[PDB]
Amino acid sequence: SATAIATLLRNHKELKQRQGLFQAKQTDFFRYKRFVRALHSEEYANKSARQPEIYPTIPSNKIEDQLKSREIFIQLIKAQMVIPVKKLHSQECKEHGLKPSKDFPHLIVSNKAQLEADEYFVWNYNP
């Protein structure tokens, strides 16, 4: 179910996912709110319409939506298929013992995953 959702949304257009440098490998990363938009995409709606037993349905009441959206994403964090990260500004890479790249931002593991809108996450899963 964590695996099922991640497999379905791993490349979804609404993640607007970019490549960054994570522990020295090129890694896709995205903001939490754009993952929520993939949960509201029509792909997810049709798969939860047919297998609500695997893909949990997103209610329409706005606050049950928010809670069901984070419940789902927390399932991905616990399965270790996404990792919360910090996206470093270039001037910050020397504080962390890194050197900036022209083509990619540096990402480092984040202390806590409080699931705010623009929190960044890297994928840690390839189907």
Contact 108, 21 (CB under 8 A): no
DSSP the chain: -HHHHHHHHTT-GGG--EEEEETTEEEEEEEHHHHHHHHTSHHHHHHHHH-TTTS----SSHHHHHHHHHHHHHHHHHTTSEEEEEE--GGGGTTTT----SS--EEEE-S-----TT-EEEE----
Listed resolution, Å: 2.5
In angstroms, the CA 63 to CA 121 distance is 23
CB distance 71 to 21 below 8 Å: no
Which residues are 95's β-sheet partners? none
Distant-in-sequence, close-in-space partners of 72: CB < 8 Å, separation ≥ 6: 5, 39, 56
Radius of gyration of the chain (CA): 15
Residue whose C-alpha is closest to residue 4's, from 69, 66, 114, 81: 81
Side chain identity, residue 38: A
What was the experiment behind these coordinates? X-ray
